Design a protein around this nucleic acid. Structure first.
Ligand SMILES: [Mg+2]
Lengths: 295, 14, 287, 106
RNA sequence: UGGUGCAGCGCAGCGCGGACGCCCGAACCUGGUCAGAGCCGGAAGGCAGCAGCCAUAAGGGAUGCUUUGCGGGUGCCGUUGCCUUCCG
């Protein structure tokens, strides 16, 4: 699978780590120093080491290679708490707040994700919220222009907190199932980003007292620690209800998922493991781990 | 030297 | 470098008092430093050599057997940062008569630096001479006069559309009546790099025939400044680099990827002589 | 980038850069820390800025000199005209006198 | 017969007052324009609105072969009539 470079320090990586090793203080240390590499998180790793020592002591373990059946369990429960598939049926339209720092993969995810809904059997309407970034709006229009996908855009510089409304109002009349819309993502001004998005969720309660329904979060994986700082910012800004890790394949820092699922607990929606639209299957716990440790 | 240092630094209070 | 240092300092802090480290742990810090350079807008190629350098040095100092690895790694990175800046302090050569050009883009303190360089050697016992080469925008030569009027250095303003030959005719005369052992020719500056400009700079160099060509680049751009120096050194021919606004820059992808990419030694820096060894310490939090 | 004329020429330059931080340009002294001026970006988040810069320009270029002449009929004046309340005006009026005061002892 | 002194009108001038023209000009409660700011709504876009500026009352000043009313120690002007007193 496209996780070979990720299994260099995780899953199959532990095999060549505990190979001919004896469970001891110097053993756990050699493991903790390896977990802090995949950007798993200091707090997360620290929690795993403790939960591991207790389990590798109250059962009498003298073989480090036996720890394999332990980490696979602990690290498996971490994602099991955030393993909640995304449902977009019943509601019409279905607003999907897309937050994230500029240049992460938002515009890219919105395209692939949109091709998934229509493939199942439902109309989708885009909405170029962030007007300041013409590089994104121009792409969102030229794209849906050939895919017969309706895109809502206005004058460059307009209120991004309204670009979504136009899509919602034109969804209840044009009959639209899924409604995806992007927003601004600038960390230069924390406060602004907060009030900006906050003033978006407080206004979408006009046409639908339940909208927005999902607050998707597009964050890059290869970034590592950055993916943690960003998610932590958007978490304190608005009420996140979904996160998607993109560009995970191609870097030995895929362990970041354990940091954006434990320290936050936000149920991961989708996961990126390629470049094609198909390479974005829903987040699965008993699947990612089964392939992560896949020898 | 030290003029508005103790002046404008108090406008944010109110 | 705020960001750069904040990333390196903590990168080693995680190894502060952890006893003997494993081979896998050593690799951690290596990558932790890589990203510290990536976000700092540092050349990819330079980023690798930087990490690889620490790899060999670490294993060479027996870091996997040292009780205090935080000390070995700290000394290792220090050697990398110092060499990445130039290794040892370097300054332009001085002799009988000197004359250099202050080429660079507009908005990088190209004119301001030229005025500071004149005041520097002035206190060392030299005799500089600010000479504007700009013949398009009269305002360019007007800004040089004011700077030279405060520092106490004579400025020679050229006429509009004046041929390089006519310039060397006066620059050599004014340097004889006042006896000038140094002539700082401040070429014209523009926002972007155009062929017409690169052409006039080359011809002006074939006439006066300087010794060294200093290029005042902006450090608040990073690799961008490196790409800009890739043109002047091709069309004209620079010999040194002068990075300014180092305080505003929190990255340093142009100072750590200068001796490698362009290969041009950084003499001065925005103003006092650039000290690779000194800056190498401020990055580790000891300067 | 005698006093009233200086206040305007100063405050006006205290917007085209931030709220800037040039407060450390004419002060040879040292600072304290960085985790403190972080609360400056908070007021920037809002679509607005401050209430002071509001009723400030809503006054005559002579009423700022001696705000003492201002009564209950003058406070409500620059109150509704700026959108602020009578209370938000007092805190502003009782300051114009402080600047012209503490300055005398300098 | 006569010379002054008359009164009441009719022409100029003078003093005063009242218009016109010019200058200045009341915080707002009058108007237009209204940076900054504030308000309304999901936006695009508006509403309300202060300082300054412009125009304009009440209330003043300088000046005006100009215009009007009234008021008198102007003037050798022509004539008639009346009258206390004075002067040939
Ligand atoms: Mg040639």
């Amino acid at each position: 699978r496209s996780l070979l470079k990720t299994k260099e320090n995780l899953g199959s990586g532990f095999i060549s780590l505990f190979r001919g090793k004896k469970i001891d203080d110097d053993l756990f240390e050699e493991l903790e120093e390896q977990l802090l590499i995949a950007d798993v998180g200091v707090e997360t790793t620290r929690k795993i080491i403790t939960n591991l020592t207790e389990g590798a002591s109250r059962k009498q373990l003298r073989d480090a290679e036996a720890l394999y059946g332990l980490l696979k369990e602990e690290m498996g429960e971490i994602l099991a708490k955030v393993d909640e598939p995304l449902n977009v049926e019943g509601k019409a339209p279905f607003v999907i707040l897309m937050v994230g720092v500029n240049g992460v993969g938002k515009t890219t995810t919105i395209g692939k994700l949109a091709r998934q809904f229509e493939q199942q059997g439902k109309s989708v309407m885009l909405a170029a919220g962030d007007t300041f970034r013409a590089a994104a709006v121009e792409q969102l229009q030229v794209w849906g222009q050939r895919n017969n996908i309706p895109v809502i855009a206005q004058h460059t510089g307009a209120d991004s907190a309204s670009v979504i409304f136009d899509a919602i109002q034109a969804a209840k009349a044009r009959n639209i199932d899924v409604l995806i819309a992007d927003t601004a993502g600038r960390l230069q001004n924390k406060s602004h980003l907060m009030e900006e998005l906050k003033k978006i969720v407080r206004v979408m309660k006009k046409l639908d007292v339940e909208a927005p329904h999902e607050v998707m979060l597009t964050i890059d994986a290869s970034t590592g620690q950055n993916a943690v700082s960003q998610a932590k910012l958007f978490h304190e800004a608005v009420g996140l209800t979904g996160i998607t890790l993109t560009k995970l394949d191609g870097t030995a820092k895929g362990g970041v998922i354990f940091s954006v699922a434990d320290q936050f607990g936000i149920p991961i929606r989708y996961i990126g493991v390629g470049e094609r639209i198909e390479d974005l299957r829903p987040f699965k716990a008993d699947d990612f781990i089964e392939a992560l440790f896949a020898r | 030297g030290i003029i508005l240092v103790l002046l404008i630094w108090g406008t944010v209070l109110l | 470098f705020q960001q750069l240092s904040a990333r390196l300092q903590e990168a080693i802090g995680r190894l502060r008092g952890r006893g003997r480290i494993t081979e896998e742990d050593l690799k951690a810090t290596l990558r932790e430093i890589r990203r510290a350079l990536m976000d700092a807008d540092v050349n990819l190629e330079v980023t690798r050599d930087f990490v690889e350098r620490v790899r060999e040095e670490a294993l060479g100092k027996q870091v996997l057997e040292s009780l205090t690895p935080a000390e070995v790694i700290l000394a290792t990175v220090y050697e990398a940062l110092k060499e990445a800046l130039g290794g040892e302090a370097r300054l332009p050569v001085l002799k009988d008569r000197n004359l250099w050009f202050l080429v660079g883009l507009q908005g990088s303190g190209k004119t301001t630096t030229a005025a500071k360089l004149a005041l520097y050697y002035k206190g060392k016992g030299r005799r500089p001479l600010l000479v504007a080469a700009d013949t398009q925008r009269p305002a360019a030569r007007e800004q040089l006069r004011l700077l030279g009027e405060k520092v106490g250095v004579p400025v020679l303003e050229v006429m509009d559309g004046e041929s390089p030959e006519s310039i060397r005719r006066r620059v050599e005369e004014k340097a004889r009546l006042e006896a000038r052992d140094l002539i700082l020719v401040d070429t014209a500056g523009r926002l972007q790099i155009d062929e017409p400009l690169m052409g006039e700079l080359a011809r002006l160099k074939e006439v006066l025939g300087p010794d060294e060509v200093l290029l005042v680049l902006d450090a608040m751009t990073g690799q961008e400044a490196l790409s800009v120096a890739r043109a002047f050194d091709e069309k004209v021919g620079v010999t040194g680099l002068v990075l300014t606004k180092l305080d505003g820059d929190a990255r340093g992808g142009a100072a750590l990827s200068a001796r490698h990419v362009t290969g041009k030694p950084i003499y001065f820096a925005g103003l006092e002589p650039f000290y690779p060894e000194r800056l190498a310490g401020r990055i580790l939090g000891m300067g | 980038l005698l006093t009233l004329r200086d206040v305007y020429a100063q405050i006006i330059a205290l917007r085209k850069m931030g709220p800037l931080s040039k407060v450390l340009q004419h002060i040879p002294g040292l600072g304290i820390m960085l985790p403190t001026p972080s609360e400056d970006q908070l007021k920037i988040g809002e679509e607005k800025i401050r209430r002071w810069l509001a009723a400030l320009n809503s006054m005559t270029y002579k009423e700022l000199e001696n705000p003492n002449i201002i009564d209950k009929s003058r406070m409500r004046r620059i109150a509704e005209g700026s959108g602020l309340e009578v209370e938000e005006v007092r805190e502003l009026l009782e300051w114009y006198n402080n600047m012209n005061r503490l300055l005398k002892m300098v």
